[PDB]
Design a protein around this ligand. Structure first.
Ligand SMILES: O=c1ccn([C@@H]2O[C@H](COP(=O)(O)OP(=O)(O)O[C@H]3O[C@H](CO)[C@@H](O)[C@H](O)[C@H]3O)[C@@H](O)[C@H]2O)c(=O)[nH]1
Ligand SMILES: [Mn+2]
Length: 537
């Protein structure tokens, strides 16, 4: 709790008379202490009011002696926020949310999911999907593959000189990709409002048949067998469950699903809506349950193996002997000297039930204010989440997302509208975007400039700052500091220990997690490039 009005009166004592702004603080603080309620959101907002009233005074009477004491109070308030969110704690809705959008859900994913299912039978599995978009991944593959061979022919006579920037290939292919997306988006807009009310898949199908020389019956078979498959595996349609409660959110989701073909970004939107509406736990399909914390204590990590690769080896080991996921890599565990391998073999083979190899989630006690998130490399990462339905913070995150898109699209829309090619569209976008740059937004603006390239070029990672981690991180900042609409600052892993997804509940560092599906690094760029050229032989 906070100090009493009376107490504040002693500590901030000044020979001078009470400023009206001080009197207001005094009143907000007293009002807060006497706040007779158990509603967390209510208590938080009153904290917020109090904190704002303090900032006003302080930012007006910069010379006031009261400021020492009032700064102490702003410190106390930060702590109070944590006190509030760490009370009225109860277990999350027992749902496991997964998202697979845009094609057939893979058997591998189904295997990862199965491990969650086994350990946590008391939880409800929801495998979210879009019933109208099973053909999106095909479209993306057809577009990217065509553009690849276009760019290769174009550069056929330069690609193998040593000094050949693989990047010249990527800039050029992106011109072709962008054109092909405008081509598809345009056809789409010519169809979507017909009286025949066609679906996304209907439009994609037509397009592919006529413009990529694909067979319709095969497309249809793939479609129905993707829908068949997902329904048989916990599948639930986002279109049939009022996840999108307003056009704005459907629009954002759609620009990712259709215009960019960024399935991960579309997934970023869905998971927030699903937690908002149903509460529970979100998990990317490449996460696995946490390993029992004490299972492996007896075996000591060699000094030559780093922390992360040790966690990896543990996982490869459990899989070597239990084979819960065929045929899980063992590339790291086979490098172990013998004596070590046998220490793993002994321990793992002794355990009898999957029950006692991985930890059960059990009750995850959270407050209606918070959302918990996993960490990675010093930043939050949204591959794993916990939130009660309708939580304050989850709303903050959703709001951050809408605010970011709004800014993005205000500058992006006209640029696209121009039908310019990629390069010129980018300049129109950038000139606009950067003309509105301030110290406060400059970083954000820098991080979204290469938006159009996300998914097709190396190190285009705008997603982070629209719908991914960045949005969460600023939402935390908002929450923790009783701020609103924060764009400049992001809380990092060292800031968020109170909001961490419990370390013993999650195995990040899975074999599937080792590679991304909306992005790729410069070294796999130099790699995919070669694969491309090698093949083009
Ligand atoms: O064809 C696809 C590809 C991706 N996804 C979704 O995207 C998620 C994550 O994709 P992943 O291959 O694991 O990419 P990452 O590089 O690991 O993605 C990171 O960055 C993304 C963008 O912010 C976030 O959505 C992820 O949670 C975060 O782990 C998946 O679990 C799916 O739900 C699909 O639904 N269909
Ligand atoms: Mn992943």
């Amino acid at each position: 709790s906070l100090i009493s009005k009376e107490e504040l009166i002693k500590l901030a004592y000044s020979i001078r008379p009470r400023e009206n702004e001080y009197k207001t603080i005094l009143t907000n603080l007293d009002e807060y202490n006497k706040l007779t309620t158990n509603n967390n959101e209510n208590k938080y907002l009153q904290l917020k009011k109090l904190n704002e009233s303090i900032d006003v005074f302080m930012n007006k009477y910069k010379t006031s002696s009261r400021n020492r004491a009032l700064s102490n109070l702003k410190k106390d308030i930060l702590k109070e926020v944590i006190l509030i969110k760490n009370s009225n704690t109860s277990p999350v809705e027992k749902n496991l949310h997964f998202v697979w959008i845009g094609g057939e859900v893979s058997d591998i994913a189904l295997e990862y999911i199965k491990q969650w299912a086994d350990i946590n039978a008391e939880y409800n599995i929801k495998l979210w999907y879009d019933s109208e978009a099973f053909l999106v991944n095909t479209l993306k593959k057809a577009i990217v593959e065509s553009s690849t061979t276009e760019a290769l022919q174009l550069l056929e006579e330069e690609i193998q000189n040593p000094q050949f920037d693989n990047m010249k290939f990527y800039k050029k292919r992106m011109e072709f990709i962008y054109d092909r997306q405008k081509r598809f988006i345009n056809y789409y807009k010519s169809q979507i409002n017909k009286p025949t009310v066609p679906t996304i898949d209907d439009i994609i199908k037509s397009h592919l048949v006529s413009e990529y020389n694909r067979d319709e019956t095969v497309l249809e078979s793939y479609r129905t067998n993707s829908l068949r498959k997902i329904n048989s595996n916990h599948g639930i349609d986002i279109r049939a469950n009022s996840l999108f409660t307003e056009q704005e959110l459907l629009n954002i989701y759609s620009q990712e699903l259709l215009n960019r073909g960024n399935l991960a970004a579309a997934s970023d939107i869905v998971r927030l809506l699903a937690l908002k509406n149903f509460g529970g736990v979100y998990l990317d399909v490449d996460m696995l349950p946490g390993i029992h914390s004490d299972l492996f204590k007896t075996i000591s990590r060699p000094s030559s193996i780093g922390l992360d690769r040790w966690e990896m080896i543990k996982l490869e080991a459990i899989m070597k002997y239990k084979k819960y996921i065929n045929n899980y890599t063992s590339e790291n565990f086979d490098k172990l000297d013998q004596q070590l391998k046998d220490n793993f073999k002994l321990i793992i083979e002794s355990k009898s039930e999957k029950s006692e190899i991985f930890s059960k989630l059990e009750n995850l006690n959270v407050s209606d204010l918070e959302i918990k998130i996993a960490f990675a490399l010093g930043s939050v990462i949204n591959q794993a989440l916990i939130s009660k339905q309708g939580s304050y913070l989850t709303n903050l995150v959703i709001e951050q997302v809408k605010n970011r898109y709004q800014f993005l699209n205000q500058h992006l829309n006209p640029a696209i509208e121009s039908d310019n090619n990629f390069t010129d569209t980018t300049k129109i976008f950038h000139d606009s975007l950067f003309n509105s740059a301030t110290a406060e937004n400059s970083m954000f603006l820098t991080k979204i400039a290469p938006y159009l390239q996300v998914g097709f070029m190396p190190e285009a990672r705008s997603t982070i700052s629209l719908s991914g981690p960045g949005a969460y991180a600023s939402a935390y900042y908002d929450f923790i500091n009783l701020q609103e609409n924060t764009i400049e600052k992001t809380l990092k892993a060292s800031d968020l220990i109170e909001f961490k997804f419990p370390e013993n509940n999650l195995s990040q560092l899975t074999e599937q997690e080792i590679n991304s599906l909306w992005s790729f690094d410069q070294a796999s760029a130099k790699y995919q490039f070669e694969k491309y050229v090698r093949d083009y032989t």
